Design a protein around this ligand. Structure first.
Ligand code: NA
Ligand code: NA
Length: 123
C-alpha cells in the first residue's frame, strides 16, 4: 500500500498543498465501490516500480465513497467528472490538467505517465 495522507475538504486540500510547497503532489480520488480504484490498488500502486517512482511525491487521497456534502463540494471544486481520477500538482502547487488520469492504467503505463510530468527536481 502506498502511504497516502487523507484529505476530506477543499480547505484541507489547500492546506496540504501549502505544506507540500516545494515538492510535487499526487491526489488520488478513491471510492470503495469503484472497481477501477481497486484495480489501481491491486495492479499498479502495488508495483515496486510505481512505488519507487512516487517516493519523492507527496501522496494525498480523498475518499469520496459516501458522496457526502464535503465530498461533492471537493469534486466540484476540482471539476472531477467521475472516478477513477488522479490529479497531479507541481512543486509550486499548480495543477496540470493534461496529467489527469481518468481510467485504469497498469504499472508500465502509469510509470510512463509519471515520467512525463513537468520536471520537479531542485538544484
Ligand atoms: Na490554506
Ligand atoms: Na505535468
Amino acid at each position: 500500500h502506498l502511504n497516502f495522507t487523507q484529505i476530506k475538504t477543499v480547505d484541507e486540500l489547500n492546506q496540504a498543498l501549502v505544506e507540500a510547497k516545494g515538492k510535487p503532489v499526487m491526489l488520488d480520488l478513491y471510492a470503495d465501490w469503484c472497481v477501477a480504484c481497486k484495480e489501481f490498488e491491486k495492479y499498479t500502486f502495488s508495483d515496486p516500480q510505481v512505488q519507487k517512482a512516487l517516493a519523492d511525491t507527496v501522496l494525498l487521497q480523498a475518499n469520496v465513497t459516501a458522496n457526502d456534502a464535503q465530498d461533492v463540494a471537493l469534486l466540484k471544486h476540482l471539476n472531477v467528472l467521475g472516478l477513477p481520477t488522479i490529479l497531479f500538482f507541481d512543486g509550486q502547487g499548480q495543477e496540470h490538467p493534461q496529467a489527469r488520469v481518468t481510467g485504469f492504467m497498469d504499472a508500465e503505463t502509469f510509470s510512463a505517465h509519471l515520467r512525463d510530468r513537468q520536471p520537479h527536481h531542485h538544484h
